[PDB]
Amino acid sequence: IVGGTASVRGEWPWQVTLHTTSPTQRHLCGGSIIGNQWILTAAHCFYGVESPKILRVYSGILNQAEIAEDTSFFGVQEIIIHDQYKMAESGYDIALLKLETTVNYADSQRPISLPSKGDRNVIYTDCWVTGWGYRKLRDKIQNTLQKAKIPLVTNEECQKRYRGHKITHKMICAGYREGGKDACKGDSGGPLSCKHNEVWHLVGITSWGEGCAQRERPGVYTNVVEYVDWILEKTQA
Ligand SMILES: *[C@](=O)([C]([C][C][C][N]C([N])=[N])[N]C(=O)[C]([N]C(=O)C(=O)C1=[C][C]=[C]C(Cl)=[C]1)[C]([C])[C])C1=N[C]=[C]S1
Numbered sequence: 009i010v011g012g013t014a015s016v017r018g019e020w021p022w023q024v025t026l027h028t029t030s031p032t033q034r035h036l037c038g039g040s041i042i043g044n045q046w047i048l049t050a051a052h053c054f055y056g057v058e059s060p061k062i063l064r065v066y067s068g069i070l071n072q073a074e075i076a077e078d079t080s081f082f083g084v085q086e087i088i089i090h091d092q093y094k095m096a097e098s099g100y101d102i103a104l105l106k107l108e109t110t111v112n113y114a115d116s117q118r119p120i121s122l123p124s125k126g127d128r129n130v131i132y133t134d135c136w137v138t139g140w141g142y143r144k145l146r147d148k149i150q151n152t153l154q155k156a157k158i159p160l161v162t163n164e165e166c167q168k169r170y171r172g173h174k175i176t177h178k179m180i181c182a183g184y185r186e187g188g189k190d191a192c193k194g195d196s197g198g199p200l201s202c203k204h205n206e207v208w209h210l211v212g213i214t215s216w217g218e219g220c221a222q223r224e225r226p227g228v229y230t231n232v233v234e235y236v237d238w239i240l241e242k243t244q245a
Contacts, residue, residue, distance in 0.1 A: 010191075034149070038141070101213065135160055139154060166226050178234040212230055
């Protein structure tokens with residue numbers, strides 16, 4: 009996260025940090041708890057991942073420092089990548105992680121409600137992007153979960169900032185015309201939370217962007233509401 013600040017512990021209870029143990033353990037991507045055994049994240053986060061056996065999901069984390077060898081984690085039983093996904097910039101950057109065990113909700117870890125189809129006409133004026141991603145285009149995984157408030161931008165406006173690219177209705181953008189605040193390397197898979205009527209909704213999934221926080225370069229996110237049917241279909245046994 010560029011231009012953000014340290015989060016308060018438990019402030020984003022749905023946020024998880026997905027680690028890979030290969031070659032040695034490190035943070036890979038962000039993700040969101042949406043069900044007792046389901047994490048929603050970006051599909052482009054499993055590039056090179058041949059098995060879910062090397063994945064570890066940590067919930068209720070604020071500082072990466074809390075993660076040690078003796079720290080409990082959730083194993084991944086299955087990685088579900090949208091069948092139309094090819095690459096982030098082309099869209100369909102969405103994936104489900106079916107945990108090996110169930111998450112016991114608590115104030116430190118609880119699910120975020122998915123957007124509705126009747127809420128596609130709602131104007132989000134309180135959206136936040138979070139993660140342990142980069143702070144600069146040349147930094148490392150941040151220790152403390154960062155947060156940043158960023159305004160959504162219309163798709164027509166976003167398309168203007170991404171010539172040569174196709175910004176579809178299955179994507180959604182957020183950013184300041186002047187830049188300064190945005191997601192960055194490592195925030196991928198993270199949630200783009202928006203509070204409406206005292207209720208948080210998973211509006212987007214951090215996906216891509218030209219660089220980080222550059223002026224006239226809004227961050228691009230998977231437009232979750234366009235995948236509620238897919239999510240239902242893939243999560244039902
Ligand atoms: C993700 O954490 C990052 C998150 C990008 C968010 N960026 C932003 N400005 N809001 N994702 C990536 O690094 C993906 N690639 C790009 O963003 C890349 O710069 C790009 C891709 C297509 C078109 C353009 Cl113009 C720029 C990803 C596809 C690698 C991470 N995901 C993996 C490691 S960090």
